Design a protein around this ligand. Structure first.
Ligand SMILES: [Mg+2]
Ligand SMILES: [Mg+2]
Ligand SMILES: [Mg+2]
Ligand SMILES: [Mg+2]
Lengths: 149, 77, 134
RNA sequence: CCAUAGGUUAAUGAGGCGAACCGGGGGAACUGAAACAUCUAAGUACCCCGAGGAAAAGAAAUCAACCGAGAUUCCCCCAG
RNA sequence: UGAGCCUUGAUGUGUAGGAUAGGUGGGAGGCUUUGAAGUGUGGACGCCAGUCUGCAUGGAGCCGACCUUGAAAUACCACCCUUUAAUGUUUGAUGUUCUAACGUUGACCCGUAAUCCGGGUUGCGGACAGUGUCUGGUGGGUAGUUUGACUGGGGCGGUCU
RNA sequence: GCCCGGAUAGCUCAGUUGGGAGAGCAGGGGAUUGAAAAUCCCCGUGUCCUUGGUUCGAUCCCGAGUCCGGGCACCA
């Protein structure tokens, strides 16, 4: 398939490229969430006419994401309370949901797609480093606390 | 019924010719597959029972044109 | 090991790609670099499987330009190496010199020879690199 | 959230029956071959959907042969 | 990771032979001050005879015509062979991770007075499974049939030109 | 019809991208032991399936043929 990128894709290229992409990749991933559009001549000319204002919105979105990363890094006041047992054993688990609830109560309605965790899900009491991906290049680090209430 | 919703491909009937040319009635079925298509103009996911050819037709024309043809000829999706 | 003479030879000849006779015989004209006159040599990894006994070829050819009667016999690897004159001979006449060699080579095609009869022909002088002929 | 799904009301229309003929979706076997499987019966019987007074088809991406004809349908030859 | 292809290396020990004779064709000029015969130093292979490679100094020397041989020098050049190593390139096998197709006969919410269905949230699985077309094997589960004539009855035997 | 494998000493099997025909078991003789066995020593194998060719030389590298097999193909 010939498709026109709408965004910075990891391996395809930058905003605007006629790349020969596989049909499944374009149909199921690139097109549904706005990242690419088919290489129809109508779309090609329509994209080449208005192209200049796309990088403007892209740059302002990237700047906003960079600002969000600094904001959530500076917040760093995250606490989750759950009834846990002795020996630092957490009965249940603190998940991305609880993390998103705490960062919602702290900052601005942070969703649960950007939040990232290692293979483990912090099943023990302690302070853990939580990863956030506001953008494709944004790497944010958050400190959390858990209470065995 | 095994009917492609885009191309109207229906199961057809033919023969099973053997080496001795014995013929027994058989059926050719369309390669149908339920699929969810991202309809951007209404921000929806429309589910269609479509064959592979019909999916390729949607690929060429665009989902909007195919849905326009559908709701023009009835066959509510 | 490698010397300036050999690196300039491989700089003059890019044998990784094929060449046509019209300019490849001019490549041999410019490869003529020795204190003494050299002799032009041609090697074809010819397609007959001389490893098959009946596919062996024996032939002869009289050349108008001289060196003028030459003989040739295929080896086990299936490669014909022949010299058909000196290097100072003009490129034009050497062209029809190897063309006469080529037609004398085709006239003796064995019926058992299955596959491409002429896999490739390369030309090289006494101290020159192999240039493919097309 | 919007929206959409869904719900209610109003208007319009359809339902079913019917001989044959017609278009389409499926589709045998007995039989013949002096047995039988390719083939035949036969796209016949039968089932189903769809209509109309008719239906279907129809204005060449057709034939022809270097001359030409000029949509479709039906009849007689061609021709067993 | 295999395997194909290109390019660079190493690679060749029977007998006389100087000694670790790859094959063919051309062919004594070529190597060399931009470091030659040498001299100490680490290994690769090995038939334990040896060949090749890195480093140190050297500042022009070195290879052959001959004894032999099926085969000549082993000065050199080109093609290629058996094997092996490296780069590059091509296809192929797995294995791992991911989610977005797809599955969900997991949970929750809604249409809704609903153990259907459909939508939504979510979990799990995940390019697997499953299905469509084609294809090798299997397939009395099912179907259509065949299973000769002569003959002191038929069968058995025998026979058939 | 196609593809592949095998034929080597009495037996069973190695053998190298060609440079001399092997190895076990069998057989014979010898040794040991009172005697025997088991061990130990010595001995002697061959159209290398056949035939032609390559080669300076062929078990090998081919061509052709015989037999033994394995798989596949096969609508006068
Ligand atoms: Mg009959
Ligand atoms: Mg039966
Ligand atoms: Mg019958
Ligand atoms: Mg009878």
């Amino acid at each position: 398939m010939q498709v026109i990128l709408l965004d910075k894709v990891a391996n395809l290229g930058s905003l605007g490229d006629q790349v020969n992409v596989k049909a499944g990749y374009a149909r199921n991933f690139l097109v549904p969430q706005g990242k690419a559009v088919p290489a129809t001549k109508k779309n090609i000319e329509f994209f080449e006419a208005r192209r200049a204002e796309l990088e403007a919105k892209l740059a302002e979105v990237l700047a906003a994401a960079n600002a969000r990363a600094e904001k959530i890094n500076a917040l760093e006041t995250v606490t989750i309370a759950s009834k846990a047992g002795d020996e630092g054993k957490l009965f249940g688990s603190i998940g991305t949901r609880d993390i998103a609830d705490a960062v919602t109560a702290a900052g601005v309605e942070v969703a649960k797609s950007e939040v990232r965790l290692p293979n483990g899900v912090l099943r023990t009491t302690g302070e853990h480093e939580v990863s956030f991906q506001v953008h494709s290049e944004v790497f944010a680090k958050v400190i959390v606390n858990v209470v065995a209430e | 019924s095994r009917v492609c919703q885009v191309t109207g491909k229906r199961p057809v009937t033919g023969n099973n010719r053997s080496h001795a040319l014995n013929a027994t009635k058989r059926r050719f079925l369309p390669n149908l597959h339920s699929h969810r298509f991202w309809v951007e103009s209404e921000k929806r996911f429309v589910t269609l029972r479509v064959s592979a050819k019909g999916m390729r037709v949607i690929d060429k024309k665009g989902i909007d044109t195919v849905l326009a043809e559908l709701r023009a000829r009835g066959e509510k999706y | 090991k490698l010397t300036k003479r050999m690196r300039v030879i491989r700089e003059k000849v890019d044998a990784t790609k094929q060449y046509d006779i019209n300019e490849a015989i001019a490549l041999l004209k410019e490869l003529a670099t020795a204190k003494f006159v050299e002799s032009v040599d041609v090697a074809v990894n010819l397609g007959i499987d001389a490893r098959k006994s009946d596919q062996n070829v024996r032939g002869a050819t009289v050349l108008p330009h001289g060196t003028g009667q030459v003989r040739y016999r295929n080896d086990k690897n299936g490669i014909i190496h022949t010299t058909i004159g000196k290097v100072d001979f003009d490129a034009d006449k050497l062209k029809e010199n190897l063309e006469a060699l080529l037609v004398a080579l085709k006239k003796a095609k064995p019926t058992q020879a299955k596959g491409v009869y002429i896999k490739k022909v390369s030309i090289s002088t006494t101290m020159g690199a192999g240039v493919a002929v097309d």
